[PDB]
Design an enzyme around this catalytic site. Sequence first.
Site, PDB file in Angstrom:
ATOM      1  N   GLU A   1       0.821  -1.202   0.000  1.00  0.00           N
ATOM      2  CA  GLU A   1       0.000   0.000   0.000  1.00  0.00           C
ATOM      3  C   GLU A   1       0.863   1.264   0.000  1.00  0.00           C
ATOM      4  O   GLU A   1       0.572   2.216  -0.737  1.00  0.00           O
ATOM      5  CB  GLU A   1      -0.956   0.008   1.200  1.00  0.00           C
ATOM      6  CG  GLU A   1      -2.055  -1.052   1.158  1.00  0.00           C
ATOM      7  CD  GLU A   1      -3.060  -0.853   0.037  1.00  0.00           C
ATOM      8  OE1 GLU A   1      -2.985   0.179  -0.663  1.00  0.00           O
ATOM      9  OE2 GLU A   1      -3.927  -1.747  -0.141  1.00  0.00           O
TER      10      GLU A   1
ATOM     11  N   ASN B   1      -7.835   8.598  -5.871  1.00  0.00           N
ATOM     12  CA  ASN B   1      -8.628   7.581  -6.569  1.00  0.00           C
ATOM     13  C   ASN B   1      -9.423   8.204  -7.712  1.00  0.00           C
ATOM     14  O   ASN B   1      -9.631   9.421  -7.742  1.00  0.00           O
ATOM     15  CB  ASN B   1      -9.564   6.870  -5.588  1.00  0.00           C
ATOM     16  CG  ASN B   1      -8.820   6.258  -4.404  1.00  0.00           C
ATOM     17  OD1 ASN B   1      -9.208   6.442  -3.246  1.00  0.00           O
ATOM     18  ND2 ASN B   1      -7.740   5.542  -4.689  1.00  0.00           N
TER      19      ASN B   1
ATOM     20  N   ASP C   1     -12.515   8.194  -8.373  1.00  0.00           N
ATOM     21  CA  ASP C   1     -13.756   8.814  -7.913  1.00  0.00           C
ATOM     22  C   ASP C   1     -13.572  10.140  -7.157  1.00  0.00           C
ATOM     23  O   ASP C   1     -14.557  10.768  -6.764  1.00  0.00           O
ATOM     24  CB  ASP C   1     -14.591   7.817  -7.093  1.00  0.00           C
ATOM     25  CG  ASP C   1     -13.978   7.490  -5.729  1.00  0.00           C
ATOM     26  OD1 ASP C   1     -12.853   7.948  -5.423  1.00  0.00           O
ATOM     27  OD2 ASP C   1     -14.633   6.774  -4.944  1.00  0.00           O
TER      28      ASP C   1
ATOM     29  N   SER D   1     -11.914  10.481  -4.277  1.00  0.00           N
ATOM     30  CA  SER D   1     -11.478  10.182  -2.912  1.00  0.00           C
ATOM     31  C   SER D   1      -9.952  10.033  -2.911  1.00  0.00           C
ATOM     32  O   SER D   1      -9.328   9.959  -3.976  1.00  0.00           O
ATOM     33  CB  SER D   1     -12.155   8.915  -2.381  1.00  0.00           C
ATOM     34  OG  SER D   1     -11.716   7.762  -3.087  1.00  0.00           O
TER      35      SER D   1
ATOM     36  N   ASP E   1      -6.533   8.081  -0.699  1.00  0.00           N
ATOM     37  CA  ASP E   1      -6.028   7.080   0.248  1.00  0.00           C
ATOM     38  C   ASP E   1      -4.860   7.685   1.016  1.00  0.00           C
ATOM     39  O   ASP E   1      -4.004   8.368   0.436  1.00  0.00           O
ATOM     40  CB  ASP E   1      -5.522   5.852  -0.503  1.00  0.00           C
ATOM     41  CG  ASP E   1      -6.631   5.007  -1.102  1.00  0.00           C
ATOM     42  OD1 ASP E   1      -7.824   5.224  -0.827  1.00  0.00           O
ATOM     43  OD2 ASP E   1      -6.286   4.072  -1.843  1.00  0.00           O
TER      44      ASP E   1
ATOM     45  N   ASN F   1      -9.102   5.098   2.856  1.00  0.00           N
ATOM     46  CA  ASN F   1      -9.818   5.929   1.894  1.00  0.00           C
ATOM     47  C   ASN F   1     -10.762   6.935   2.545  1.00  0.00           C
ATOM     48  O   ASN F   1     -11.470   6.605   3.489  1.00  0.00           O
ATOM     49  CB  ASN F   1     -10.603   5.015   0.951  1.00  0.00           C
ATOM     50  CG  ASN F   1     -11.112   5.731  -0.271  1.00  0.00           C
ATOM     51  OD1 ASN F   1     -12.292   6.040  -0.364  1.00  0.00           O
ATOM     52  ND2 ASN F   1     -10.228   5.992  -1.221  1.00  0.00           N
TER      53      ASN F   1
HETATM   54 CL   LIG Z   1      -9.735   2.126   2.657  1.00  0.00          CL
END
Ligand SMILES: [Cl-]
EC number: 3.2.1.17
Length: 129
Positions: A35, A46, A48, A50, A52, A59
Amino acid sequence: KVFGRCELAAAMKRHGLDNYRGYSLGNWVCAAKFESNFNTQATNRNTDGSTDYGILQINSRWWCNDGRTPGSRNLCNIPCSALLSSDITASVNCAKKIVSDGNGMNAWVAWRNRCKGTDVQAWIRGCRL
Ligand SMILES: [Cl-]
């Protein structure tokens, strides 16, 4: 902060992640490796809109507030910036909620794709734990 492998394993264990929801420490270290490469300051946007955040790339769509993710929730009741701290407490506490949400560690797509079913014990090999 960029953690060392065994350094992160130890911090995660201290914060009670070892075998949390049945997931051994190696699973958590493996997830963090892919990650964030163990970097608490990692962020990624992301598709969309959003974002991380942190060692486990949590998120803003559901888990934290960043003020710029429309219609999102903040189920860990934290600013997303808290997930970037050198102190992993906020990331760990929020990860505990996520992994309890129903789908276990599959919530982390990178865990499913790169850690799940592998020899995750290798991630804590050598570590004084
Ligand atoms: Cl998440």
